[PDB]
């Protein structure tokens, strides 16, 4: 990709493409698929502690941004381009997990229902850190509650996973640039 020719493509997106076009490792794509499917299963059944213990690295940055709408031709206005819907370290994820599990979280009664659909999995080892695994995947996340509330979330996820305690691969970075500027789902209180 030449972003001077492909005018709509950002430098960041072009860099990420390059990562997966190169050394395609079939076995790695399958390991990644397993990792993400099991992670999604834990989240869907609301096993948030198990998710932290099994899927999330101590050094994690879990980040979801919302980017301000700017002109495609904009070149002068240089103030903060995005805010962080999430930008969590492990302890901050733990706070959110405890908030979910608290018996006085009134919003969680009756129990919520989550269904996640993970697709378009791609995987590639980092060039310089042969222990760092890049995984890209897309998620549709369906949340249903209280009879007739239904919220569906859609996102692409740029992950880094690395082997941790016991040799288990764990999430050390998740980055999502949320595609909808104004949320129509009451909140973004779901783990993408």
């Amino acid at each position: 990709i030449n972003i001077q020719e492909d005018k709509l493509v950002s430098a960041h997106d072009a860099e990420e493409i390059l990562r997966f076009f190169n050394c395609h490792d079939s076995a790695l794509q399958q390991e990644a698929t397993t990792l993400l499917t099991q992670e999604a299963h834990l989240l869907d059944i609301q096993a948030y502690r198990a998710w932290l213990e099994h899927c999330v690295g101590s050094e994690v940055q879990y980040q979801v941004i919302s980017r301000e709408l700017r002109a495609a031709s904009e070149r002068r206005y240089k103030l903060n381009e995005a805010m962080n819907v999430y930008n969590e370290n492990f302890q901050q994820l733990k706070v959110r997990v405890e908030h979910q599990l608290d018996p006085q979280n009134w919003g969680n009664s009756p129990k919520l229902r989550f269904t996640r659909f993970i697709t378009n999995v791609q995987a590639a080892m980092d060039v310089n850190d042969k222990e760092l695994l890049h995984i890209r995947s897309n998620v549709i996340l369906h949340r249903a509650r209280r009879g007739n509330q239904v919220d569906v979330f859609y996102a692409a996820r740029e992950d880094k996973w690395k082997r941790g305690e016991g040799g288990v691969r764990k999430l050390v970075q998740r980055f999502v640039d949320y595609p909808e500027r104004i949320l129509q789902t009451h909140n973004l209180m779901v783990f993408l």
Binding site: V64, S66, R67, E68, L69, R70, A71, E74, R76, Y77, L79, N80, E81, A82, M83, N84, V85, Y86, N87, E88, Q91, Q92, V95, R96, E98, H99, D102, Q104, N105, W106, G107, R146, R181, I182, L183, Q184, T185, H186, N187, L188, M189
Partner: protein, 446 residues
């Protein structure tokens, strides 16, 4: 419904008909008597600091372009082309000398003037009076220490007078701290609540905190955390409540400078606020310096709210009677270290943003209380705001406004709804004033 006669809010603001959160005809009436009449939050200097900088904002259901002029002033205009009514600007922020319509190419200046029309000479000749075709301008735009508000009604009081007794409480943080900056862009989320539900909650609802936010208090370890699950009532003198003539009001929780921020920010914040307070004692006196580092939950009437110290800044943008678009910014003190500002901004969004775990606790409360206002057996029912009634004062030697000298009560609900009813039943500012000539007496009865 006859808005001249219908008692939607009872005497002294003691109760409100539940229909006010659900009635679409009343919502339409509010567009005229609330949103087209009163001061509404637009932006901050920090988001449009240079000539040509602009943002879009809602004012009621209308959209405006808010632009920094070459002379340093700010003007705001309807985001609507004067030709065939297309939306002029489709982005949220930028820098430009003007705006060109994508329909027929009319070009308007940052000053709202119609500057160019494609092929004007060949098509219109000299017959198009461009001088009369400027963008429809917001009549009034004023600043409160960098915070920019607009009002469509030329007859409105100046913004400072409109803030009334609330201004005294805001000044230590907004002015004497050296000034605040708004950190953008805001989070934006639609909730299925009436705009009044979160507005009333921020203006005067300390009662809900221990119970609604039990899980967030317990999980986050913030400084108000002893309240979790109503485990403990704040001591005597823990705070106060106030309200004002034009409807703005707030709660004051003494010393709560770290606010809702989780324990990871508490020591740094409590150190920073205390240090500035020690300097401010000499300038504005002990009480006002203490107010600076005290947690204020405030609504600037009608639909702008904030938690000072926590740094949460909200616009409850009305869509219909059961739909509100919530904008969330962070406020920081200009002289904070940049790294602290960044972490404070993230923490504001962490707690009260689109995935704010505190804000999520409030969702069902606001949405169902609003939606119930449409239900047949509830429309004519009375929402109660009588807590603390008969113990409020006015004209106190230290704390101005109508004041309840207790941390938890409904003083600010009463003043908010008194002003609301006076506007809804009035056709203009003169009538509001007439309807408000004994405002504090009404609030302090019994």
């Amino acid at each position: 419904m006859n808005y001249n006669n219908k008692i939607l809010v009872s005497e002294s603001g003691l109760s409100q008909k539940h229909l006010i959160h659900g009635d679409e005809e009343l919502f339409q009436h509010e567009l005229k008597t609330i949103f087209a009449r009163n001061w509404l939050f637009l932006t901050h200097d920090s988001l449009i600091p240079a000539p040509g900088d602009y943002v879009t904002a809602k004012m009621g259901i209308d959209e405006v372009i808010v632009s920094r002029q070459n002379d340093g002033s700010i003007r705001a205009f309807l985001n609507v082309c004067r030709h065939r009514g297309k939306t002029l600007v489709s982005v949220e922020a930028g820098n430009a000398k003007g705006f060109v319509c994508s329909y027929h190419g009319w070009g308007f200046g940052s000053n709202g003037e119609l500057q160019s029309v494609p092929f004007e000479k060949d098509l219109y000749g000299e017959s198009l009076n461009k001088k009369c075709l400027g963008l429809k301008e917001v009549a009034r735009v004023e600043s409160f220490h960098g915070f920019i508000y607009g009002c469509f009604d030329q007859e409105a009081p100046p913004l400072m007078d409109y803030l009334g007794d609330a201004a005294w409480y805001l000044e230590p943080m907004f002015k004497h701290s050296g000034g605040l900056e708004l950190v953008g862009p805001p989070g934006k989320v639609v909730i299925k609540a009436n705009w009044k539900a979160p507005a009333e909650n921020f203006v005067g609802d300390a009662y809900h905190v221990g119970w609604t936010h039990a899980s967030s208090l317990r999980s986050g370890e913030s400084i108000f955390s002893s309240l979790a699950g109503n485990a403990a009532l704040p001591p005597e003198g823990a705070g106060l409540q106030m309200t004002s003539k034009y409807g703005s009001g707030m709660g004051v929780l003494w010393d709560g400078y770290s606010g809702v921020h989780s324990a990871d920010l508490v020591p740094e914040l409590m150190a920073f606020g205390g240090a500035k307070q020690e300097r401010l004692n000499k300038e504005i006196g002990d009480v006002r310096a203490r107010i600076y580092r005290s947690h204020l939950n405030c609504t600037v009437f009608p639909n702008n709210s904030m938690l000072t110290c926590s740094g949460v800044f909200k616009v409850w943008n009305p869509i219909d009677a059961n739909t509100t678009e919530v904008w969330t910014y962070a406020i920081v003190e200009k002289d904070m270290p940049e790294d602290l500002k960044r972490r404070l901004a993230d923490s504001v969004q962490r707690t009260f943003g689109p995935a704010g775990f505190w804000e999520s606790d409030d969702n069902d409360n606001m949405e169902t209380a609003s939606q119930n206002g449409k239900k047949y057996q509830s429309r004519d029912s009375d929402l109660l705001s009588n807590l603390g009634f008969g113990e409020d004062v006015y004209g106190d030697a230290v704390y101005p406004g109508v004041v309840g000298k207790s941390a938890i009560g409904e003083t600010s609900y009463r003043g908010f709804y008194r002003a609301y009813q006076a506007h809804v039943s009035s056709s203009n500012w003169a009538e509001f004033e007439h309807a408000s000539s004994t405002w504090h007496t009404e609030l302090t009865k019994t």
